[PDB]
């Protein structure tokens, strides 16, 4: 048997189609998020909005609920439909159920959505992966990622392929078991990962930081440039 | 090859299956349709594998309203099915808007219909291209709908087998200020150029849209107009 069909096993049991979904994600750009002492911080890179194109329509980050936001890497159409599905799911569950929503339920829901759209022929799996941030682990922060194979997991920090190969190794080398001292060092580590990222010029890099008690916050390019310069100076006296 | 299925693109960004349906349009019997200052003319030719037929038992020119003319070039059965659905759609619009179908509305709706068969491999698009003429707002108009599910307008047009010479004749012969009878004469002339053999009332039928209403030429009228073509 071969990979020409969604539901067909390889003779050694592999499903080459979902592996191709993961690889189609792997061609997608860098996406690295971490959870700090209290805050969860993310950084959007490689947008490269060229002059005539506007950066507003890029949608570097979309907030599902006040305690969860997402952007996904890969195909923007699939990212958008999954954003709409997650937003509708969380809002409807909070509105309808006798008790409100937690990030774990929406994590399960999106994992189930990927597994479902992956499960049958005539229905292409999503070619996107995303790194989930939640505020209400009894007020504590927590971090997941999602995968086209309908797979999710929890991390102290996570990255995906294009950013994984370099940045994630840099994190596993650097990540201190002590949570980054305050959101200041959280943003410092995010900027360091962006330094491990390809270009780090600040022309398209933007970040969104969520404190797990405060709602989501959006960072301005000027503050991002100031943080990048601070990290460059810190590397400068590191000699 | 890529024409095996209609649901996929070619690397050249072409739908090979839709093209071959238009080849069946080329295999259709040529029809000539031109507009005049006072109306529109739709002419077509017929031939029989034997004189055993009742050549008047069926009609190739069909109306959709009392003031609409319509002619095709393709295989008969798909044409007749499309005519039935077009008449029913016109009736539905008459029920809804309390008005008869406008020519533009009719052509867009029938083209959307003919697009409805352009999805999924279990169905096949019509091998029929349509010529539509009608009166609207006191002025004559004409268009054409093709198996692609689209439409385009035309002051002078024709299609079928050996259509390119008809195009050349229309380019070098048609002007926008022609008169209805002279339009019928031009139509029969370009049909005679388009098909071999003598053109007689057994061989051609023509429908003309007048602003008040549309009618199909009787066999005696076909004999009279076909005779003394210049």
């Amino acid at each position: 048997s071969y990979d020409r069909a969604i539901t067909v096993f390889s003779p050694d049991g592999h499903l080459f189609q979902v592996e191709y979904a993961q690889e189609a994600v792997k061609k997608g750009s860098t996406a690295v998020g971490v959870r700090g002492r209290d805050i969860v911080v993310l950084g959007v890179e490689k947008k490269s909005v060229a002059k005539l194109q506007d950066e507003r329509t890029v949608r570097k980050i979309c907030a599902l609920d006040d305690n969860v936001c997402m952007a996904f890497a890969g195909l923007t159409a699939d990212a958008r439909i999954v954003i709409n599905r997650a937003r509708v799911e969380c809002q409807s569950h909070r509105l309808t159920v006798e008790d409100p929503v937690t990030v774990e339920y929406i994590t399960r829901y999106i994992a189930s959505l990927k597994q479902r759209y992956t499960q049958s022929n005539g229905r292409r799996p999503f070619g996107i992966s995303a790194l989930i941030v939640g505020f209400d682990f009894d007020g504590t922060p927590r971090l997941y990622q999602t995968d086209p194979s309908g797979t999710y997991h929890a991390w102290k920090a996570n990255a995906i392929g294009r950013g994984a190969k370099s940045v994630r190794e840099f994190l596993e080398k650097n990540y201190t078991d002590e949570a980054i001292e305050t959101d200041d060092l959280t943003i410092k580590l995010v900027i360091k990962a962006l330094l491990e990222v390809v270009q780090s010029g600040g022309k398209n890099i933007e970040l969104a930081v969520m404190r797990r008690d405060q709602s989501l916050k959006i960072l301005n390019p000027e503050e991002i440039e100031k943080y990048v310069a601070e990290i460059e100076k810190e590397k400068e006296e590191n000699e | 090859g890529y024409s095996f299925s209609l649901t996929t693109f070619s690397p050249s960004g072409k739908l090979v299956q839709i093209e071959y349906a238009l080849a069946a349009v080329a295999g259709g019997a040529p029809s000539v349709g031109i507009k005049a200052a006072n109306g529109v003319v739709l002419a077509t030719e017929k031939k029989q594998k034997s004189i055993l037929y009742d050549e008047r038992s069926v009609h190739k020119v069909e109306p959709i309203t009392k003031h609409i003319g319509l002619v095709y070039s393709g295989m008969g059965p798909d044409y007749r099915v499309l005519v039935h659905r077009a008449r029913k759609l016109a009736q539905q619009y008459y029920l809804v808007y309390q008005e008869p179908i406008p020519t533009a509305q009719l052509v867009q709706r029938v083209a959307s219909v003919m697009q409805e068969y352009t999805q999924s491999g279990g169905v096949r698009p019509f091998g029929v291209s349509l010529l539509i003429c009608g009166w609207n707002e006191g002025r004559p108009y004409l268009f054409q709908s093709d198996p692609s599910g689209a439409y385009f307008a035309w002051k002078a047009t024709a299609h079928g087998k050996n259509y390119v010479n008809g195009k050349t004749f229309l380019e070098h012969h048609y002007n926008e200020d022609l008169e209805l009878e002279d339009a019928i004469h031009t139509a029969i002339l370009t049909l005679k150029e388009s098909f071999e053999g003598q053109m007689t009332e057994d061989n051609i039928e023509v429908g003309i849209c007048n602003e008040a209403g549309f009618r199909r030429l009787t066999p005696t009228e076909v004999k009279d107009y076909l005779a003394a073509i210049a």
Binding site: - | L22, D146, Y163
Partner: protein, 238 residues
């Protein structure tokens, strides 16, 4: 067409005339050339011309033999052409219509990556249509530019006419300028074709004709071959 001559000369004639420049500035010599444009329209006419001015051996390969299509000899035939070219250095290798199987493509890429430029041996491979494969070939060590062949302009088509106009006679006032403007967007060989189809129009009267009117209908029958279904194609693709 003029821009084609300069860049091909800079990439073929120049590496032939002054190898000292590339060694003095310490560069690996340019290795490959690739041509975009409508089929022919000076495509082969250029490659054949440059080889004459450099006097190097010209190799002509059609796209047809490239695509033997039954694993004919594509694996080794590429090498056999290459080795013979090295034996007759300096030489120019030309292939046309690459668009007209994957295994011999990898074979060519490896040879393109592997053979030495120590013999003024270069590859000029030409194409007609814009293909997805073509953009993949533009890689390090294989090809270095994107020469384009546009359809000839009004005065440009006139020069094409004048190229074959030496042999043909003329009336007391044949204005090729007015004849030139009647075929907008026509390719090059078709401008030869209108001269070609004016050819047996001289046989239509079985004597010296080459008349101004002749080209006016020598235009007529040429354009339709460059035509016909293009009228429908609008009603087809739309």
């Amino acid at each position: 067409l003029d821009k084609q001559i300069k860049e091909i000369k800079e990439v073929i004639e120049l590496p032939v005339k002054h190898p000292e420049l590339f060694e003095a500035l310490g560069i690996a010599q340019p290795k490959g050339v690739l041509l975009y444009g409508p089929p022919g329209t000076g495509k082969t006419l250029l490659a054949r011309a440059v080889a004459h001015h450099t006097d190097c051996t010209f190799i002509r390969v059609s796209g047809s033999e490239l695509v033997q299509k039954f694993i004919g000899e594509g694996a080794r035939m590429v090498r056999e052409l290459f080795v013979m070219a090295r034996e007759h250095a300096p030489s120019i290798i030309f292939m046309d219509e690459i668009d007209s199987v994957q295994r011999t493509m990898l074979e060519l890429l490896n040879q393109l990556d592997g053979f030495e430029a120590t013999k003024n041996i270069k590859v000029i491979m030409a194409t007609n249509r814009i293909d997805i494969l073509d953009s993949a070939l533009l890689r390090p060590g294989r090809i270095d530019r994107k020469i384009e062949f546009p359809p000839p302009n009004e005065e440009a088509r006139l020069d094409i006419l004048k190229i074959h106009s030496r042999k043909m006679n003329l009336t007391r006032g044949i204005n090729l300028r007015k004849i030139a403007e009647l075929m907008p967007g026509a390719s090059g060989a078709e401008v030869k074709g209108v001269c070609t189809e004016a050819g047996m129009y001289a046989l239509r009267e079985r004597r010296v004709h080459v008349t101004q009117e002749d080209f006016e209908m020598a235009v007529a029958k040429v354009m339709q071959k460059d035509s016909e279904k293009n009228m429908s194609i609008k009603k087809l693709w739309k």
